[model samples]
Structure formats: structure tokens, C-alpha cells
Target: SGPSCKHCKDDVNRLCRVCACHLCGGRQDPDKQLMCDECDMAFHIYCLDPPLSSVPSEDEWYCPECRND
Candidate 1:
């Protein structure tokens, strides 16, 4: 069977916060989304708190929640 989101029960490619963009929860541009290294939550490039201009080049990254904790 094909995989799906654990929280939303939607396809992995669908627009879902648990599976896609955690901030906007809309899967507009798949390329601009960045997954956190710690919690594995996905954040859109433009939806970040300081709003990233583009996908980060860094190999390792942490989300706001992970950083704050």
C-alpha cells in the first residue's frame, strides 16, 4: 500500500501540516519546504518566522519548536 500522513490521513504529497508545511499547511511549492532535523516537521521557506528567501544550504537544520526547547 502507498504511504499517507499519520495525522491527516491524506496522501504524503497532499497539502497537510503534519506531512508538508507546518506553518501554512498548504503544499504550494514542494521544493521550498524544509524538514526539521530534530522533530521532522516541515516548514515552508517563505513561512518561517524570519522568512527564508530560499531553501537553506545547510545540511542540518532545526525548527523553531526544537530550537526553543
Candidate 2:
């Protein structure tokens, strides 16, 4: 895999805007980060307000910013 945070980009920057951590704006832990389907912004599974010990097994997920359901 590559070091890009986003799978695709609207533009360019120092970090992957799509996969950047929402809380710390970081791209260190790709496996530990949980990305949202609604928005490209990624959140660390352990960095969430209530940190998670493991990755989820859901087919889809939404963040507070774009939780339609």
C-alpha cells in the first residue's frame, strides 16, 4: 500500500486528508484507524472519545458529522 491517507484526493497536502485522524490529524496508524464511509475523515479506533480495543466488523459506518441514521 501507499502512504496516502485518502484513497483519492480533491487536492494535495502534507498528509492524507481522507485518512487523517480526526482527533490528532495524524496518519501513523492505518490499521488502527477507523475511517467513515460518509466522510473521508478517519478516526483512530483507540483515539475515539471512548477508545476501542479492536477494529469493527461492520460493512458500513458513519461519524457524528454525517450520521444520517
Candidate 3:
């Protein structure tokens, strides 16, 4: 129980290398998390590499890491 999720209020495991939130390292709600197709990491819309003011209207979104790759 390292930290709590901001959205779901669940326990966040910081050591989880695969599925934890990229910003605060919290356990994000499945409905609220954005998955990058390339890197396959979970990110909150508001916690983007270059933070976004709102969710994009595009059909797909990619993380900065994927964009650079």
C-alpha cells in the first residue's frame, strides 16, 4: 500500500512495472486510464508527457515515448 488511486480510491502498488499510472504511479481506473498502443503503458489523460487540458477527440492517442519511437 504505497499510495492510493486518485480516481478509484484503490491501493496503488508503486513497484508494479507494467500497469500502474505513469504520472503519480497510482493504480488508475480502467475507464479513466489511457493506454498507449506502442509502449502499452497506462497514463491518465491529465498526466500526459506534455500534459493535456482535455482528452483528445482523435480516434487514437499515443504517449510521448511511443511518438518518439
Candidate 4:
């Protein structure tokens, strides 16, 4: 019913971070999966592989990957 990217919210194509493929769910980079302070979407920090456990510095804490919206 929604985009399958899982990493990105507005990710209509559902691209996989690990394989970088559309409509795929590959092995996630632990650091890349970031939790948003506002929504349930997950984000991936482009600077860090698998991203960081703690929230990165941003006025709005959203996962880079899933923050497409």
C-alpha cells in the first residue's frame, strides 16, 4: 500500500541502501537506520556507514534515507 524502500518515507521507488535497488529490503547498514524524533520513518546518514546510534545534529531529527517526505 506504500513505498517499500523502508529507509525513505517519500521513497516511492523503495530503494535499498545495501544493494541500492528499488523495491528491495537488503541488509541494512546499522548506522544508516536513523529514527526520527517526530515520525516513525528511519533515516541513513550519508556521511556514516550504517549511521550512528545517537541522533545526528539537526533541528529536525529525521533519518536521511527515509526523510524523503
The lDDT per prediction is: 0.63, 0.63, 0.54, 0.44
Assess candidate 2 and give its TM-score to the true structure: 0.56
Lowest summed-lDDT stretch of 10 residues in model 3? 1-10
> Against the true structure, whose lDDT is highest?
1
lDDT per residue as tens, model 1, 1-69: 442566565555555665567666655454566667687667656665676786785525887877999
Runs in model 4 deviating more than 4 A are: 1-26, 47-60, 63-69
Prediction 2 global C-alpha lDDT = 0.63
Ranking by TM-score: 2, 1, 3, 4
Stretches of model 1 off by over 4 angstroms after superposition: 1-4, 10-15, 48-51, 57-59
lDDT, residue 60, model 1: 53
TM-score of 4: 0.27
Which one wins by TM-score: 1 or 3?
1
> What's each prediction's clash count?
0, 0, 0, 9
Off by over 4 Å in 2: 1-13, 48-50, 57-59
- Across 1-69, the per-residue lDDT of candidate 4 in tens digits comes to 433444544565544542332223434543344435555444544434463456554525654455586
Candidate 4 local Cα displacement, residue 59, angstroms: 12
Q: What tens digits encode model 3's per-residue C-alpha lDDT throughout 1-69?
A: 333334343434333333556555544453456666576566666655675656564415787776876
* lDDT by residue for model 2 (1-69), tens: 454534336445445556667456555665667667778577666776797876774525777678855
